[PDB]
Amino acid sequence: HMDPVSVWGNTPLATVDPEIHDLIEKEKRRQCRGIELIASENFTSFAVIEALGSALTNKYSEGMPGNRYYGGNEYIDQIENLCRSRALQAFHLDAQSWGVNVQPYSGSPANFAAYTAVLNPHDRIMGLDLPSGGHLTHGYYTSGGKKISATSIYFESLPYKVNSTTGYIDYDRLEEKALDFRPKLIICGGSAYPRDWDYKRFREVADKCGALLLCDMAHTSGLVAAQEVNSPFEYCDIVTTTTHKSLRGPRAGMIFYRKGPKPPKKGQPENAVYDFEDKINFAVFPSLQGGPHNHQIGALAVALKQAASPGFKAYAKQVKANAVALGKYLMGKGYSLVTGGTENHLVLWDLRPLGLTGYKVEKLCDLCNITVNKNAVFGDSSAPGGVRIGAPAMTSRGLVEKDFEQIGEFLHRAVTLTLEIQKEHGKLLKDFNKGLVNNKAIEDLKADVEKFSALFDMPGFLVSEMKYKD
Amino acid sequence: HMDPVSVWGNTPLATVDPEIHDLIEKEKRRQCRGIELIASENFTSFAVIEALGSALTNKYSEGMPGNRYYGGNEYIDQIENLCRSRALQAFHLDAQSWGVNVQPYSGSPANFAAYTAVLNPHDRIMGLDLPSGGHLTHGYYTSGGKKISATSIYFESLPYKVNSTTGYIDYDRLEEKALDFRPKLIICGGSAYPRDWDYKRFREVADKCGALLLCDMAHTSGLVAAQEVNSPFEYCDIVTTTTHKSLRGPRAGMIFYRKGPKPPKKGQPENAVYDFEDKINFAVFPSLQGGPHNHQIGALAVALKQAASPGFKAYAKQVKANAVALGKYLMGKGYSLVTGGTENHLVLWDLRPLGLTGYKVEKLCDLCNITVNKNAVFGDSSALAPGGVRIGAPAMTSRGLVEKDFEQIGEFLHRAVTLTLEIQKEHGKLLKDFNKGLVNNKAIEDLKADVEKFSALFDMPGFLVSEMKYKD
Amino acid sequence: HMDPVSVWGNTPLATVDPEIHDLIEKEKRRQCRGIELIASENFTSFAVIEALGSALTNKYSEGMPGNRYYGGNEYIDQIENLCRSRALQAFHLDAQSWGVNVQPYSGSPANFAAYTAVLNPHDRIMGLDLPSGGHLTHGYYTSGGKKISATSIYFESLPYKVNSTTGYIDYDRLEEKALDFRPKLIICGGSAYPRDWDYKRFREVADKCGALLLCDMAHTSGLVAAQEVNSPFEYCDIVTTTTHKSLRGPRAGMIFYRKGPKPPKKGQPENAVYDFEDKINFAVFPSLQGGPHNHQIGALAVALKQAASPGFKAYAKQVKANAVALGKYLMGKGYSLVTGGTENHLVLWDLRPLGLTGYKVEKLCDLCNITVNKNAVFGDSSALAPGGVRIGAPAMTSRGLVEKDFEQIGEFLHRAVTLTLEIQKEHGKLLKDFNKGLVNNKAIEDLKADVEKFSALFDMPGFLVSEMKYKD
Amino acid sequence: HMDPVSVWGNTPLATVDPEIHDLIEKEKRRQCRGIELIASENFTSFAVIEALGSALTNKYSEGMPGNRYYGGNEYIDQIENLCRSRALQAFHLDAQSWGVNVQPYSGSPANFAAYTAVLNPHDRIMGLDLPSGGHLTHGYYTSGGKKISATSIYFESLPYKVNSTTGYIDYDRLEEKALDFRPKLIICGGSAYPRDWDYKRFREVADKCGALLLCDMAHTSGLVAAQEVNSPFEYCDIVTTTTHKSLRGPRAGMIFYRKGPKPPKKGQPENAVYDFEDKINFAVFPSLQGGPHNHQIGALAVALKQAASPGFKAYAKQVKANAVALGKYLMGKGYSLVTGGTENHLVLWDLRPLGLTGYKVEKLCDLCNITVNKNAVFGDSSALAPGGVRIGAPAMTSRGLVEKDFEQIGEFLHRAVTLTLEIQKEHGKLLKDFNKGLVNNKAIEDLKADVEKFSALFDMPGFLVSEMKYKD
Numbered sequence A: 001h002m003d004p005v006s007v008w009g010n011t012p013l014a015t016v017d018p019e020i021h022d023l024i025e026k027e028k029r030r031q032c033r034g035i036e037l038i039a040s041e042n043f044t045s046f047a048v049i050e051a052l053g054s055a056l057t058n059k060y061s062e063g064m065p066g067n068r069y070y071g072g073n074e075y076i077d078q079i080e081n082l083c084r085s086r087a088l089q090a091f092h093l094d095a096q097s098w099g100v101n102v103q104p105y106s107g108s109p110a111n112f113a114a115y116t117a118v119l120n121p122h123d124r125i126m127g128l129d130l131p132s133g134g135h136l137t138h139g140y141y142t143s144g145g146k147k148i149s150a151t152s153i154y155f156e157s158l159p160y161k162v163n164s165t166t167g168y169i170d171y172d173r174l175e176e177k178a179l180d181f182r183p184k185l186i187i188c189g190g191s192a193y194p195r196d197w198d199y200k201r202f203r204e205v206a207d208k209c210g211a212l213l214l215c216d217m218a219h220t221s222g223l224v225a226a227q228e229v230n231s232p233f234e235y236c237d238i239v240t241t242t243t244h245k246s247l248r249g250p251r252a253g254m255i256f257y258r259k260g261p262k263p264p265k266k267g268q269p270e271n272a273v274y275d276f277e278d279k280i281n282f283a284v285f286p287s288l289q290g291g292p293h294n295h296q297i298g299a300l301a302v303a304l305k306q307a308a309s310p311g312f313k314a315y316a317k318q319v320k321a322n323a324v325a326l327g328k329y330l331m332g333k334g335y336s337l338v339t340g341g342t343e344n345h346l347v348l349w350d351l352r353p354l355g356l357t358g359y360k361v362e363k364l365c366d367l368c369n370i371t372v373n374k375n376a377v378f379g380d381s382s383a384p385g386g387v388r389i390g391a392p393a394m395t396s397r398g399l400v401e402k403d404f405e406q407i408g409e410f411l412h413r414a415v416t417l418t419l420e421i422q423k424e425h426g427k428l429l430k431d432f433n434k435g436l437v438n439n440k441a442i443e444d445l446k447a448d449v450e451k452f453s454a455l456f457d458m459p460g461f462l463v464s465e466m467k468y469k470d
Numbered sequence B, C, D: 001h002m003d004p005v006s007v008w009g010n011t012p013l014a015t016v017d018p019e020i021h022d023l024i025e026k027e028k029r030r031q032c033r034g035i036e037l038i039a040s041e042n043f044t045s046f047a048v049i050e051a052l053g054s055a056l057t058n059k060y061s062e063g064m065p066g067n068r069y070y071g072g073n074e075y076i077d078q079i080e081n082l083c084r085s086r087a088l089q090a091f092h093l094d095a096q097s098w099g100v101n102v103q104p105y106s107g108s109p110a111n112f113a114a115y116t117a118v119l120n121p122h123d124r125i126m127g128l129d130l131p132s133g134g135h136l137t138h139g140y141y142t143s144g145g146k147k148i149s150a151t152s153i154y155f156e157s158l159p160y161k162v163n164s165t166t167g168y169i170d171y172d173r174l175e176e177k178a179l180d181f182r183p184k185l186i187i188c189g190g191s192a193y194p195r196d197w198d199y200k201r202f203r204e205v206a207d208k209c210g211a212l213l214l215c216d217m218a219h220t221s222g223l224v225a226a227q228e229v230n231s232p233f234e235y236c237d238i239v240t241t242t243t244h245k246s247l248r249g250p251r252a253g254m255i256f257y258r259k260g261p262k263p264p265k266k267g268q269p270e271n272a273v274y275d276f277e278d279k280i281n282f283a284v285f286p287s288l289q290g291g292p293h294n295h296q297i298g299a300l301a302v303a304l305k306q307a308a309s310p311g312f313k314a315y316a317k318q319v320k321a322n323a324v325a326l327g328k329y330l331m332g333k334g335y336s337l338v339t340g341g342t343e344n345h346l347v348l349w350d351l352r353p354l355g356l357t358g359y360k361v362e363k364l365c366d367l368c369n370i371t372v373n374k375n376a377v378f379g380d381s382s383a384l385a386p387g388g389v390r391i392g393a394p395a396m397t398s399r400g401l402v403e404k405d406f407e408q409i410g411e412f413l414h415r416a417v418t419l420t421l422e423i424q425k426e427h428g429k430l431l432k433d434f435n436k437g438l439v440n441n442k443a444i445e446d447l448k449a450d451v452e453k454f455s456a457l458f459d460m461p462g463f464l465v466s467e468m469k470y471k472d
């Protein structure tokens, strides 16, 4: 005999699986009791989460709205249509000039599908080098020649780099490389680049070598929606993005592409129109993905309505102001920030002038409930040299500039202690790690961090309902 | 000024976004007021859905447990380790002999990562042809040579087929083709094959041509977990799966792979060990994916605990018995089922003897709240109007239906196809003319009313019917 | 100080390099004092050899006549245009419907350039499997999956096979394979297939799967020119060939290709024309080759004039008659010929029923001045010691031998194979042991003496035996 | 009835084919009565030509000496063994450290086989950019992105360039690109680079990025054998070459490769040995080529004996002195030479400062019996009309010309370019305009007369002027 539906199918998680419920409750407390500075993380809304955890997960809906491979999609089609239209609206796009596919499962799927749409295997791509700030999916192989990303396996990558003096993209070297290498696709946007992008100059380079131009705006998508950074749509053929970073939605991807008449170009016939739509859609399905995750699409529609609000514009302005304030505090203490500041949501902190690796600082911070990630900086070839710090998550908890200065001081205390441990125990990991055991100053820093963090509000769930309030 | 956290971030969906809320509520009613027969669909538990919609979505955790590229993973690591251990336990695997990666975002990502782990670009693969019942990601290109799946673009595919008269896999032709084509990887498992698989024979073929053997058990994984169909782990090097079909979990993928000593093989070195684990993990991350979706992984752990329960074994038995009972009713009316029955959760219904396409039958059924999908059958070339319909039992079995209820489903389907014939008989076969017969059709309205009255007799997992916005 | 031009540059080979001169003189004697049966060899004319060894070797002439990358090509252009026009005439082709590129350095370069012209890397090809009689460059990889030819590396190959019983091409399995595999190019023609080709059926299969059709007529090109076997030009898009086998010219290749209006085909545009010429020329140069070898082109023009003569048609008839007479003689004794005879210039002889390898038979024959080559037969996996020996009539027919003379060759081969078996019986099957039987073997010496006496009865093209250094 | 062997097979070319014979005699006269300055051309010896035009053309000999796929190779094996050993001797190589394959049909086949030996499809290579002086087969695609050479289709190329101001290889940019691009193979050597190569720095770069290092010494191979330029063998893993340029042999290619113990390397284990030999041989045959052209191999053995002589060393010294003398004469007239001089056999002459294309000068020169080729210089994109002319000394040095004669060649070139300008200023700078300048131009006719008068007097290797059909 089967279990009655009510028993297996309607009983709450707390009863069906106390082990997982307890771990989720412990993770909720952790998210509350630390300083969360991973630049790619955010805290999304309870409304997004309610759509994410919904019966939308039950539906197979391969295809496009109105052109599906399964029956039963009368409401899933309306949700997807709404998501697509809100995506165009959130980025201020004319629907006769731009379309969007909202089915990519995440950012890496979105990029690989965009490449598959416009490239054959082994076609050439150029993206920002990972140590210069680019993403894995922009064609990462190592300076020792190890192919890491599938984008350097199925396609042929040659990365472009920042200038070693300024830390900004070296646009003349990009142009020289593109004219020599002749890529079919140039990628802009990145994961750890602290400045805005000259999309006009990227378009000039693309046109000079005949390449397509794609922007991957995953990290700054929220700032783009709020019109707080340069818009890639003015100059790029394709724009990809995640939805869970500064855009503050579920984990998903989107692919935007031009539609309609093309601008005048020499050699190009008159009245030509863009031809990306069908290729992009086909690449997502049936080429690469299967059934869309409709709970993600529904959650994304919610996030995109929230991103078009005046409150979200104020949030995006605050993210930038908090990152500047943090950078100014760290630079005042004498620390080295790549490019000497920031124009977006993150700072990239070079730790090599202190004699520290990113692993050591990240490891110590983690023990103090300060959540960062070690990060490559220019020169690194696979313990990198830097740490990356972002403002979106803690700005979502309501922190403003003075609070981000306190974050700077906690970061200052953490690095000061990492130096003292390394001076006392040594720079070799086996020695250093003996400094992280029964260290009263780590425990004191952890305690002060927890005190500071626990008091702020938290989106996504009710603190008053959580299992672990201590 | 920013909105307070309570306004934008803690307010319920019903207030923040009434439009999306209303559509979810309409979809909730649609799922429990019709007959849901898509063989790849299920109705998952509220406990799975509570984990899916959780703060686990906020975490970046690239890497593996204990070996991450970010801090903060004390609890995400425990959740992922529990998910992996429960996956091995759900399929009765020894941790010394099998490992599993639970980060694939869905089934197609799981397969492409498994292939990327063991194949170079353009290496050769052989899977079941799509019109014979294989999946897109098993190397699908069309009989006209059009490459459709990326698995026929980035790799070199040569599909194997069923016997054109019996509907069973032609194992002799599989072997002949494999010895000529020399694939690096043979794939078994499928999307619309109504019979079990001779994994032992697949292993003999793979050994004869030196290929790896992978099973994609996506559709029947729940039945595998309940030991109700043949276990691919006895013979396959790698087993991939989704988790949202018969397994009744969230939408995700897993890749199982052998570990430890290799069984004795001629010319193979002594002490040889399997070498899949590092390659498969690396393929998933950093090669193909980014951040794991930890809310899916947590939800999957719940589903895997539920799949190990006595109740779930009874469920899998009932899925099979319901599919058999439905098939018996349909052939009793004279309809044509591929292989003339089923050994799993689905039947594949060949409509071409009736002069119908699956598109017509799917469309009329949809108007009656009977949710199926049109499906390719052997010989088909049209994806818009293939020659069959595929019917599955997992979803309705999850609402508590047993054999007598699936016989009534058979009668509703018989009415639907009878009606589809009647409309084609009057209005004609061209789609433009057929669609005119679907406006103000009293027999459609009657059948729709009967389907909904029948569907309302049963409970519904995942949400409380008593609390939904659109009641009756 | 430099040597005077007369010393280094005008002095004959006999004085400048006695060592090489003596070896050439020894090879001249070897060629006219034994029985030369390698099916891909011939004895070309002195006139061809005089053009081959000429000042034409000094010229760089990249490009096409009239469109070159170097100056100075007034006369090289006239030679190449004469070579191309004579090539079309030799094969009875109208210049409005066929063109030809005569720059390929040999046969394997010609095929790889033709493939490069119409295929992208990894595009799919189908040719006759090597143990079934196809060439290396028709996509050869082994039954163990080892890629041998670059045509199985840079392109994706699926060979088609002969019937294992009859030795004839299995046209039904060809069609089935082509419809499953969907090749871009199907190749016909071969190296060791002893029957003619159903080009009409190959065209039917190519049309059914949308493939281009290419015939590699290297071995039988002389018979084609003489209209003594089926013409591939009636049905194939492209025809490649060497020029040194039955065509009796220098070592070189040619690529023939269709021009002008395409024949009507459903879905194909009205007024569609062929588009091979520019792609094929570009593939040869600048894609793959550098400077043409104009001394080969001039020598080829000579051979193509000779091939258009009444005398050459009689030679091609006699080649076929000699091969048939040899085959009937060997079969009367009980030797196993593939397909039980021949329709061209060669027989393929399966030694496995004797418990012999082609290597043993080739080695013993060589000691008797009977020159053959060991050859794969259906099912072989060993290239060192295949199970067959291949015998061709072109070379000895060029020395004027007729049917009764080829029956004498049959008797010599029977003696040699009998002796091979006797030695294996006495000394063993292991090569180390078998080789001991080849020392001071009176029967080998007897057979060698009979072979040279016989060979000395006939004239010899290409050089004057009366003036050769090693007389008798 | 067949033609008697004597009639078709022993009759001389002059009687069998008067049309081709006459064209060869006209080409012999053309070679005598012009100034031949194509830097890749030479006049080879009669002794080489006698081996080239010989019965060696009749033999199939696939495989290696002592390990063939055909019988009858007792003397062909001795010829190939002698060719290989003479190749090692001519370049002063220890046979325990170096081996050589002498089967490549020409230079482009040698390079493609060397690449295929050590690279998989789409592996990365880096060679000198064609407008900077590299060869097509070093990975040539255009600055507009058009893939031209097969080496940029089947492999992934990124060329390195010369310094835009000095015309020398930019070694710092080479290193920067190699570290960014990470090629598997770096190629050095060129077709139009007028300076020697810093192989030591190339080896430093290759070691830094983990690449193999190959030198293509085709153009300067004769100078390398005479030890008149830097030896690539000191630093390169593989050395390819043609044999018909400054080496003065037949048209063929060779691939030299390291053998034996590897030099100490940190990551490399102890007692490591080179593993190129079997891969190189396999790439030539059976991967890419078919039967070797034994008449080429025999002729090459002759040329390699000649290259090891003291007279050949004096020839190489004179080639260099003649190229320097010519460059000094041209620069003394105010012309622009790339890098301002030469260290080898050629000069590269930049005509853009005069407002001329290489097409115009090439074409005027050809009308005056001055044979050059237009040639890309740094920055060019047009293959129809590049900006330079390349001038080489090997061919006329082989006719016995010394420094004073090459100064006269300078004045003939100076006269030719002066006419080209005069025509340009009069008739115009558009080809429609210009080609009117080359009609009934008395100065062109006068220059041609003076060139023929000068050229006809010099000795000619390869045939006897006293015997040629056209002495006027």
Ligand SMILES: Nc1nc2c(c(=O)[nH]1)N(C=O)[C@@H](CNc1ccc(C(=O)N[C@@H](CCC(=O)O)C(=O)O)cc1)CN2
Residues within 6 Å of the ligand: A062, A069, A286, A290, A291, B129, B130, B131, B132, B133, B134, B135, B136, B137, B142, B148, B191, B192, B373, B374, B375, B376, B382, B383, B384
């Ligand atoms: N046997 C089997 N049945 C199945 C699936 C499968 O993978 N295998 N599916 C797994 O999800 C669904 C069908 N998915 C399909 C997706 C695309 C095409 C296809 O051929 N598309 C072409 C033609 C489109 C057209 O004609 O309109 C194309 O996209 O161009 C076929 C089936 C449901 N049933």
Ligand SMILES: Nc1nc2c(c(=O)[nH]1)N(C=O)[C@@H](CNc1ccc(C(=O)N[C@@H](CCC(=O)O)C(=O)O)cc1)CN2
Residues within 6 Å of the ligand: C130, C131, C132, C133, C134, C135, C136, C137, C148, C191, C192, C193, C373, C374, C375, C376, C382, C383, C384, D062, D069, D286, D290, D291
């Ligand atoms: N049907 C047919 N007969 C033919 C040829 C052909 O191409 N097709 N040949 C056309 O010339 C010659 C045989 N050429 C061959 C060259 C290499 C291998 C081969 O398989 N080589 C492997 C194995 C070496 C070994 O076992 O020793 C290798 O090179 O690795 C076979 C045949 C003569 N007879």
Ligand SMILES: Cc1ncc(COP(=O)(O)O)c(CNCC(=O)O)c1O
Residues within 6 Å of the ligand: A060, A289, A290, A291, B039, B040, B106, B107, B108, B109, B135, B137, B189, B190, B191, B192, B216, B217, B218, B219, B242, B251
């Ligand atoms: C055997 C099989 N494998 C993989 C997948 C893909 O899973 P995703 O859709 O999550 O990518 C499917 C989907 N099959 C869907 C169907 O049969 O309707 C499948 O049937």
Ligand SMILES: Cc1ncc(COP(=O)(O)O)c(CNCC(=O)O)c1O
Residues within 6 Å of the ligand: A039, A040, A106, A107, A108, A109, A135, A137, A189, A190, A191, A216, A217, A218, A219, A242, A251, A252, B060, B289, B290, B291
């Ligand atoms: C620019 C960019 N693009 C795409 C992605 C991939 O998103 P998914 O993880 O959903 O695949 C990332 C991830 N960046 C993660 C980080 O910077 O920490 C990214 O930074």
Ligand SMILES: Cc1ncc(COP(=O)(O)O)c(CNCC(=O)O)c1O
Residues within 6 Å of the ligand: C060, C289, C290, C291, D039, D040, D106, D107, D108, D109, D135, D137, D189, D190, D191, D216, D217, D218, D219, D242, D251, D252
């Ligand atoms: C450096 C180099 N390498 C290889 C080759 C090719 O040789 P073949 O033409 O035999 O394929 C050339 C030809 N160079 C011809 C020229 O510079 O005019 C060459 O210059």
Ligand SMILES: Cc1ncc(COP(=O)(O)O)c(CNCC(=O)O)c1O
Residues within 6 Å of the ligand: C039, C040, C106, C107, C108, C109, C135, C137, C189, C190, C191, C192, C216, C217, C218, C219, C242, C251, C252, D060, D289, D290, D291
């Ligand atoms: C059908 C066929 N095609 C091409 C070639 C290649 O020609 P080259 O060797 O010139 O590359 C051969 C050589 N076959 C040689 C044999 O059968 O003995 C051949 O048999």
